[PDB]
Design an enzyme around this catalytic site. Structure first.
Site, PDB file in Angstrom:
ATOM      1  N   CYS A 212       0.822  -1.199   0.000  1.00 39.76           N
ATOM      2  CA  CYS A 212       0.000   0.000   0.000  1.00 39.76           C
ATOM      3  C   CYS A 212       0.859   1.253   0.000  1.00 39.76           C
ATOM      4  O   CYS A 212       1.758   1.410   0.837  1.00 39.76           O
ATOM      5  CB  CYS A 212      -0.940   0.007   1.199  1.00 39.76           C
TER       6      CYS A 212
ATOM      7  N   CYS B 134      -0.273   4.228   2.783  1.00 41.57           N
ATOM      8  CA  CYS B 134      -0.012   3.614   4.081  1.00 41.57           C
ATOM      9  C   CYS B 134       1.412   3.860   4.559  1.00 41.57           C
ATOM     10  O   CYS B 134       1.672   3.867   5.757  1.00 41.57           O
ATOM     11  CB  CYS B 134      -0.259   2.111   4.032  1.00 41.57           C
TER      12      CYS B 134
END
Ligand SMILES: [Zn+2]
Ligand SMILES: [Zn+2]
Lengths: 119, 117
Positions: free
Chosen positions: A41, A44
């Site tokens: 991700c 993230c």
């Protein structure tokens, strides 16, 4: 003699047995953030640090939990996680608010103050 | 700083969310036999008289209930009734002992004295 039973009577005389859906009940002693993330991700990564920071700025006042969906598929699945990250703001009472996607320290705090702390 | 959670920790510290908490909470004030029966059931025919007899011999100490699966499909279905007769022995605490297939005065009394009392 022997007593004959309807399902109706069964509920009163034997067991009120249906497995009724459990209502949401938070068990933590503080409000919390729950961060559903994955390692592939993008945001993230630019967010993890921002989180670590808020976890200190609001230390003692809130908990910040992280969940790696890859390491916990059952949990992620049970909660319909889809967009990554998926972020949860959980108050001591009431339903969690859920934000699909990334956020800035400003927006985060916004939710921490306004929602976690009933400001 | 931030705390990682496993599912098992989640259940301890966030919400015990699954519907896996349901507890058998017997509602009677005495131990009970629950007899599942049906009109198409042969062996039942010879199990009925016995049960009635036992209802007397043990009056006051236990209840003996009968459930007609033909008239109570949900109950049968919900409890995964595999065949007839199924018989339950329900303590005052703890899970019911379930036996499938017919039984005898001797076997019943056996379960009634040991498991119920
Ligand atoms: Zn599940
Ligand atoms: Zn049902």
């Amino acid at each position: 003699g022997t007593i004959h039973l309807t399902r109706a009577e069964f509920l009163k005389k034997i067991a009120d047995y249906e497995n009724h859906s459990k209502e949401w009940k938070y068990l933590g002693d503080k409000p919390a953030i729950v961060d559903f993330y994955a390692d592939w991700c993008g945001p993230c990564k630019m967010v993890a640090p921002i989180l670590e920071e808020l976890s200190k700025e609001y230390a003692g006042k809130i908990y910040i939990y992280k969940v790696n969906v890859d390491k916990e598929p059952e949990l992620a699945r049970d909660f319909g996680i889809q967009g990554i990250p998926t972020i949860w703001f959980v108050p001591m009472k009431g339903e969690p608010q859920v934000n699909m996607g990334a956020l800035s320290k400003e927006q985060l705090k916004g939710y921490i103050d306004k929602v976690l702390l009933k400001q």
